[PDB]
Symmetry: D3
Subunit: 219 residues, 6 copies
């Protein structure tokens, strides 16, 4: 059951409204690595996660992401607030889509559920969640490097922080299953070619050397 308290976790604080940046910020509202993606991925996973311990974790983190989503939407509201007659505004998608957040990315691409990565075994879900957090932190860094003022930059820092936090949670959820560094899961046992490496593009490293792999220099 969903409840809602109106004010956000952190609080809206920006400088002069920056509509051009607000459009870049849509990437974390309606974009692939955005907050809607995280919130919906971890939540839809929880429905088929049998272990109550991890199902709870997914739901806690998911609900937090709904609050991050709320926050980003407020930054976008403020950065497109009372500036609809400026020329900076007129060069943004907000000029035709209206002020405020919209569930699209910075390129105007509507949010798709193809952004999501979930299903089957919990190992896939957790590994997909780790990847989604990596994408999230990445986009948050690029936006911080482009942030208009300081109040924005630090709200984005807090968000970027929580994704590093979440990354740990998922990493520890896997560790409890002993599947953190163990590449194998599922029920299908591998054949004899499992430790082979094919040099199909022609460099050496631990990914193609002993004791981990039998390197095949020329197929």
């Amino acid at each position: 059951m969903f409840f809602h308290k109106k004010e956000p976790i952190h609080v809206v604080n920006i400088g002069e409204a920056n509509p051009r940046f607000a459009q870049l910020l849509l990437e974390q509202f309606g974009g692939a690595t955005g907050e809607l993606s995280a919130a919906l991925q971890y939540w839809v996973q929880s429905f088929h996660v049998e272990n109550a311990g991890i199902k709870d974790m997914l739901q806690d983190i998911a609900i937090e992401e709904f609050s991050h989503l709320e926050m980003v939407g407020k930054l976008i509201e403020a950065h497109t607030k009372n500036v609809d007659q400026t020329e900076a505004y007129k060069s943004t998608l907000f000029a035709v889509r209206g002020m405020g957040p919209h569930f699209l990315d910075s390129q105007g691409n509507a949010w798709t559920a193809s952004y999501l990565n979930e299903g089957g075994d919990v190992v896939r879900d957790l590994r997909a969640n780790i990847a989604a957090e990596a994408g999230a932190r990445q986009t948050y860094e690029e936006l911080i490097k482009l942030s208009p003022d300081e109040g924005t930059k630090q709200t984005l820092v807090h968000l970027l922080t929580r994704e590093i936090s979440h990354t740990q949670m998922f990493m520890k959820a896997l560790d409890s299953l002993g599947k953190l560094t163990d590449p194998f899961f599922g029920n299908v046992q591998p054949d004899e070619t499992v430790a082979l490496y094919y040099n199909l593009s022609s460099e050496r490293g631990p990914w193609n050397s002993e004791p981990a792999f039998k390197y095949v220099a020329n197929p």
Copy 2:
């Protein structure tokens, strides 16, 4: 440059043609967790990966996935050959689209680059590659349990096996950077709320408690 030799990795060996299974098999041709996704994700990453070692690894694997894509395509061609009058065939999308593989999934959804997860830091790429590898293994397991004949099963088992192989390659690469189990990456320093968990939805675990998290029961 690309080069192609006509012989596949493993020759196609199927029982009687099963066009309904052929449609399910499209999940690995034009599906989200499919071979085109793997091939394109790793290859597009190689254009912005600086480490010459890791870049080469991404290309080696990507080229293999193209060859996996070929095998999946040959399986689908075989299970839809000379059967366009059976009622099984007429209940598939192959009846209107034509025999052989197409870049759709099992639900007829056209492949979309929205499936891909890539960009920026190599830590993200490798983590995205590990997640992608999981979903590929998962989908392959489901197809294995639904396989129509033993020859088809073995070909799918080998394909699944290579995803296990690829997972290890990606882990060893991520581990060689010391970032396989280290949640932090990037340039943005974390703040004060890093090691805090919020009970926004009581099940507990290492993701939730000491020594890595301070539990907040009621926010």
Copy 3:
């Protein structure tokens, strides 16, 4: 700020699990007229709705829809629970996508934000919300006509009920603005052709007759 209490408003109650129907039910999870659509439309609208009275209404209804979304996801979980070896299951998308809800419709189409209808003046938002409720109720009726058991049929009846409720709320939100039956809004005054009707496909009614319109039988 989002909070979550684990158990749903109503309670899971079905008969024998029906995976084929569960797929039809995805229409209200990840479909156009589904619960995610309503929840996200009314919520993203609230960010640019200036009137606090209506902004609150949108948020109340939106949060309720998140709980409807939770409910439908539980029906789908139950109707795909412990049936993964039946042949009914094997003919569904769940066979390859895994058990449990997924943010796609009954046709396997991923949820898109193009489903959403919002922006600009509150009159558009409310009229779009009325339309979204009409679509919602429609799909709920078709599913009720196809429901497997009685416990399902009545959970769907309660959902269909609340959408008729919501329809009223929006209809009364417009009435408070005096824009319920008044076709005009915005700031652009119409020209002289506003009351014309062009017979471009060649029947009469109030939509093309006096006193409302000047009918043009032949352009």
Copy 4:
């Protein structure tokens, strides 16, 4: 059958060519609230609307929208003619896509039938048509305020005017069924929780209180 005569409704009268505005104008050619959406939504409804009167109305309007689509297309052709060397033109999608209209929106998003809202009950269709009409009017207003010359503005004003006209036609049709202000439609009888409001997020209103709703302050 369809018939086309080469002369548009209003001849194109623009100032100097403005290719940047031409891109914004694509919102009414290949955009969500655009003329193709209106034309196709109303037309596809006519195939399942039983009432011979309403069905004819949908076709009359749909054919007009096709003619509106033509005018928008002519506007876009005019504002992108013989200017492919100006730097304004080179900053638009017309530089790679070619001059003239294309079935994309102002962000380059290909038109998608996901824009359409239709199906089942005629009450839904008309309500979907009213909502669609609102978004069309809204987008037209924004384009009017951003128009490059007076001749372009007047053409857009007339187009906006017809959407006001169409809204009334749809209202009169919905009213003739007694369903313009009546929230109920369909065959499924409502249950016990029909007239109940939940304060899940205190602002009050006719949507929230007596005599139509029993307020639930804390669920």
Copy 5:
């Protein structure tokens, strides 16, 4: 301007309703090779084709494609009407989407303008149209071989026949420009490699023999 008389190019007649065939038939309505693709592509091209003769031809053909679209819709309508309770109907997407045509294909994929090939040069446009025609005729043939009855079969045969006609029109247009059998077009001068053929996959034919090509047997 557009105009519409109510009877199709010719009477549509079917046997009993076959809703399962109607879903397949959606390919020619909201599918890639369907009538909407043909209509829109040729029409959108007319806005930038400078040859008044070829422009008119495109318009002539597009308007006929609209009439074909109406026919396909009416066939789909007839094959889905009054058969709600039948088990065949319940196995189709019409069960949840409603009776009659919808702008999607046989798989439930919403129609997208990405189906269209157009822009820039008339030679590109005309070649695209010949290709689109070939896809339409191909799809029609597959439907014809799946025909539920004879009345339907003869309608689809006529529609197929008209695509052959259009192909001849487009070829005559291409041939009037001298570009039907001459590959070169545009304003860019080719370099020294225009006659090279690379044997990158390992067969001979006119595509890699003298006089036309310098065959590179081993790159």
Copy 6:
């Protein structure tokens, strides 16, 4: 099987980085007329083309299209590397998506298999390919006229030239089947209306004159 050597068809050389041109260049990478469309379309066709000669030709060409794709990627890479701080770069989608090519077009649209035209008959396939080639050459020309420097211009000229080459290959293949100038193909016999031309829009040409057509001046 697939194989990869590391150097392209020829050396890629540019001037200074022009990230704004690199975004335009994405059309030939992840765009509709791009190299991925060409590669995948011709390759996927090879799985169902029965003519061993034409099958091999399709494979030969597709593998070359892959090499072109690598080149386009490398051009995009060079034009986006080491220029993060520059204001031009910050105006591009690379600012949020990262340096280098991504499988999207100049508008940010993710690549989709809906760009592909294929299936059924080799004649349909070959005509589709001639059309795809025409789109590629057209796009290349627009990029060439927008070239940032001479090194880039000469690479795009070569790539354009190779499309002219492919067009000749596909034409020779079509001509070997006797279907280059003959519209008819497939297994369905046309009816009595194959030579009719309808003047539905109101010009004359070989597309509607004797000997080929019976012109219907007024339907």
